[PDB]
């Protein structure tokens, strides 16, 4: 790859510069290079990888929704341009999923790390499901559900109910239920038990991550208000 000649530490350092410069494509390229050195990622490095690709794919999703709305509210130009953005978004999702499957998801390592990568697999299949249609679609929805569910099982076994990976996973799985799988009840049921169990075991908040935890709890509460 383009990054193959650069030392892993320099790739990590440049990803941090790119984050500061808000060059998120560059940051994602740097972290792809770092992953491809074949060593596992630390929590800080996982955060870099997450932030980079989510920023890239988030702008693609927002563009896609703008074009998709113009297309629905209606020449071939809008469909053509929407299809171009769609194709680029699927390319980024395939890249992330390839990294997860080629390099990041392994049998061992941190349960923290295993849950995060499985959640990230679920997320990027969900982003593909937002733009999918045919035989592609139910296939994609099932890979998303499967990855989320495997992450759920590990997280409930190995992490306290306020842990931010566990919380963010449960929040995202419930969005999958509501927006992708058309299961409003499951989404409400998961978000409720997730919030309630976090509160019941509030004492497990961690000194170095409690602000992340309480933020997700609030977002769960926001979805429940919107869904009820």
């Amino acid at each position: 790859g383009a990054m193959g000649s650069m030392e892993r530490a320099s790739l990590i350092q440049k990803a941090k510069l790119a984050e500061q410069a808000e060059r998120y494509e560059d940051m994602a390229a740097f972290m792809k290079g770092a992953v491809e050195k074949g060593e596992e990622l630390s929590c800080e490095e996982r955060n870099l990888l997450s932030v980079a690709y989510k920023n890239v794919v988030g702008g693609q999703r927002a563009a896609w929704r703008v074009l998709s709305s113009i297309e629905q509210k209606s020449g071939p130009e809008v469909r053509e341009y929407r299809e171009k953005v769609e194709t680029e978004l699927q390319g980024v999702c395939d890249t992330v999923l390839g990294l997860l499957d080629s390099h990041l998801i392994k049998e061992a390592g941190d349960a923290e790390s295993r849950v995060f990568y499985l959640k990230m697999k679920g997320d990027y299949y969900r982003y593909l499901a937002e733009v999918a249609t045919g035989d592609d679609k139910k296939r994609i929805i099932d890979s998303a559900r499967s990855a989320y569910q495997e992450a759920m099982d590990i997280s409930k076994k190995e992490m306290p109910p306020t842990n931010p990976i566990r919380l963010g996973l449960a929040l995202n799985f419930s969005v999958f239920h509501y927006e992708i799988a058309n299961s409003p009840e499951e989404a409400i049921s998961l978000a409720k038990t997730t919030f309630d169990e976090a509160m019941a075991d509030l004492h497990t908040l961690s000194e170095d991550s409690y602000k992340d935890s309480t933020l997700i709890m609030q977002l769960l509460r926001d979805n429940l208000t919107l869904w009820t």
């Binding site: 955060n47 932030v51 988030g58 929040l171 995202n172 419930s174 969005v175 933020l215």
Partner: peptide, 10 residues
Amino acid sequence: QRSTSTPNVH
């Protein structure tokens, strides 16, 4: 309003 997912913050 779309549902809210995990935000892209630190």
